[PDB]
Amino acid sequence: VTANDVINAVNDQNAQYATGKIGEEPVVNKSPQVISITMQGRLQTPQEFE
Amino acid sequence: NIILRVNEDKSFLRIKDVAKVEIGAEQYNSTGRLNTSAAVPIIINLQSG
């Protein structure tokens, strides 16, 4: 494994968030509840990094 | 008409085949009512001084 491979890994596995929504306005059904979607990849623990 | 890919038979795949494009608002979330009638509400803030 080259260092370059490692740099890339960290850049991907440890990443920023992405937010979506469920049952939003465009849909025809008009769901009574609109629930947000949360995606996280941030790594906080040393063990997670390894 | 945007071509996603060739498809190995010279028959292009297109956005139309996999989607439905239309002009439409970025956020359909909010609306405005004036005396029980649709309207867009424009708020004018006063500059300081």
The C-alpha R_g of chain A, in whole angstroms, comes to 17
The CA dihedral of B26, B30, B32, B33, to the nearest 10 degrees, is 140
Distance from CA of B26 to the nearest CA of A (A): 10
Residue B28's closest chain A neighbor by CA?
A25
Beta strands in A1-50 (DSSP E): 18-22, 35-39
- Angle ∠(A23,A21,B13) on CA atoms, nearest 5: 90
Across the interface, whether the CB atoms of B29 and A26 are under 8 A apart is answered no
| Distance (Å) of CA B34 to CA A4, B25, B44, B45 | 61, 21, 16, 19
A13 φ/ψ angles, rounded to the nearest 5 degrees: -65, -35
A26 touches chain B (CB under 8 A): yes
Instruction: Please give the Cα distance from A3 to A18 (Å, whole number).
Output: 28
Resolution reading in Å: 3.1
C-alpha span between B16 and B14 (Å, rounded): 5
Radius of gyration of chain B (CA): 22
Helix runs in B1-49, H state only? 15-18
Burial class (CB in 10 A: 0-12, 13-18, 19+), B14: middle
Method in brief? cryo-EM
